[PDB]
């Protein structure tokens, strides 16, 4: 909560409406230094979440918060997530990332016990319901892509133990994703 | 030829679809390395007797007791209990 909120809001708002307006930032130098420090701060904060996601998996409330943020995202109209947004995105990717389930390491059971997105039937249902919504994100593509990744995960989970109810939901999800031309 | 009475006793249709893999095996001519199709039919029976034992196991994971294998009940089914069928070891 605090983390994301802070970083994002602070940075953007402040700069754009006080510093891009008043230009306390002054010299073609001072303005740049201040701009760089602000951008660095935004990036360091985004990286902090990313670095965390790369380690700790995310809890139910924190994951929903991250999804809530990504629902509002504009990839800059310029058509490129700026150094910050791209990172937030890959962070979410790693949060969702289930690739660690495919690496045949003797630690699979221990790692499964540590991955918050493992022991909560409510986690899969909540994410699935959000991604099935035709409330797409600010960016229909966002709804389409995460949907597809959750779907590949659902596809494998049949092999692990016997979790194969959601295997069906993968074909329509994949179709929606392809229809959003996620590619 | 029938099945309703060979379901109450399906256990017998496994000791004999083995004796018919052996009398098929006598004519498998699979003594030399050249024979192959005949070592593919011995495996097709091995797959079916196997997935039949897989089915007896997963139907002993779908318990109803809230003490005997709590997983699959009101408790998380993401971790199955002992993958044994709780078979008594028929001779």
Contacts of B81 in chain A (CB under 8 A): none
Q: CA B11, CA B15: separation in Å to the nearest integer?
A: 7
The CB density around residue A52, as the number of other CB atoms within 10 Å, is: 16
Residues of A in contact with B58 (CB under 8 A): 162
The DSSP symbol for A138 reads: S
CB contact under 8 Å between A162 and B79, yes or no, is no
Unique residue bearing structure tokens 């002993």: B60
Provide the experimental method for this PDB entry. cryo-EM
Phi, psi of A80 (to 5 degrees): -165, 125
What separation in angstroms does the CA of A31 have from each of A8, A20, A24, A44?
20, 9, 8, 20
For every residue of A87-120, which 3-state class applies, written as one string? HHHHHHHHHHCCHHHCCCCCCHHHHHHHCCCCCC
Structure tokens at B18: 């083995």
SS3 labels along chain B = CCCCCCCCCCCHHHHHHHHHHHHHHHCCCCCCCCCCHHHHHHHHHHHHHHHHHHHHHHCCCCCCCCCCCCECCCECCCCCCCCCCCCCCCC
Closest Cα in chain B, distance from residue A49 (Å): 28
Size of interface A-B (CB pairs under 8 A): 14
DSSP H or E stretch at residue A170: helix A170-179
Q: Evaluate whether A9 touches A42 at the Cβ level (below 8 Å).
A: no
Distance, in Å, from the CA atom of A69 to the CA atom of A87, rounded to the nearest integer, reads: 14
Under 8 Å between Cβ of A150 and A127 = yes
Name residue, tokens 């329509």.
Answer: A172
Helices A83-96 and A30-55, packing angle to 10 deg: 10
Determine, for residues A118 and B58 on separate chains, whether the beta-carbon distance falls below 8 Å.
no
For residues A148 and A174, the answer to whether their CB atoms sit within 8 Å is yes
DSSP state string for A33-65: HHHHHHHHHHHHHHHHHHHHHHHSPP-HHHHHH
- Degrees, nearest 5: CA angle B48-B52-B57: 145
Give the pair of three-digit tokens for residue B54.
């897989």
Spatial CB neighbours of A93, under 8 Å, sequence gap ≥ 6: A149
Mutating which of A115, A161, A165 best tests the B interface, going by the most B Cβ atoms within 10 A? A161
Nearest alpha carbon to residue A143 among A95, A37, A91, A72: A72
CB contact under 8 A, A161 and B76: no
Interface of B with A in 37-76 (CB under 8 A): 58, 61, 76
From CA A49, how far away is CA A8, in angstroms rounded?
12
Question: Using CA atoms, how far apart are residues A66 and A57, in angstroms rounded to an integer?
Answer: 12
Round to whole Å and give the CA distance between A172 and A142. Answer: 16
**Cα B21 to Cα B47: distance, rounded to the nearest angstrom:** 13
Cβ A82 vs Cβ A73: under 8 Å: no
φ/ψ region of A139 (left if φ > 0, alpha if ψ in -120 to 50, else beta) reads left
């Amino acid at each position: 909560n605090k983390i994301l909120t802070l970083i994002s809001q602070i940075d953007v708002n402040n700069e754009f409406d006080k510093l891009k307006k008043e230009r306390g930032l002054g010299n073609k130098k001072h303005r740049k230094e201040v701009s760089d420090l602000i951008k660095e701060c935004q990036q360091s904060l985004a990286h902090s979440l990313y670095s965390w996601s790369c380690q700790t998996p995310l809890n139910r409330e924190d994951t929903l918060l991250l999804i809530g943020y990504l629902e509002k995202v504009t990839v800059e109209g310029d058509g490129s997530l700026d150094k910050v947004n791209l990172t937030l995105l890959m962070s979410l990717l790693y949060c969702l990332d289930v690739g660690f389930l495919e690496q045949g390491t003797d630690d699979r059971e221990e790692l499964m016990k540590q991955a918050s997105m493992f022991m909560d039937r409510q986690y899969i249902a909540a994410i699935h319901n959000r991604l099935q919504n035709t409330q797409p994100w600010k960016s229909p593509g966002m709804q389409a892509t995460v949907r597809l990744a959750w779907a590949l995960a659902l596809r494998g989970i049949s092999q692990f133990s016997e979790v194969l109810e959601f295997s069906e939901a993968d074909e329509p999800m994949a179709e929606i994703a392809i229809g959003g031309n996620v590619f | 030829t029938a099945a309703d009475v060979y379901f109450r006793e399906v256990s017998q249709m496994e000791i004999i679809f083995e004796c018919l893999v052996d009398k098929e095996e006598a004519d498998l001519e699979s003594t030399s390395i050249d024979s192959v199709e005949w070592a593919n039919i011995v495996v097709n029976v091995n797959t079916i007797l196997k997935d039949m034992l897989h089915v007896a196991c997963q139907y002993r994971q779908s318990k109803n007791s809230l003490y005997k294998n709590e997983s699959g009940i009101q408790e998380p089914e993401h971790v199955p209990w002992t993958a044994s069928s709780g078979t008594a070891g028929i001779r």
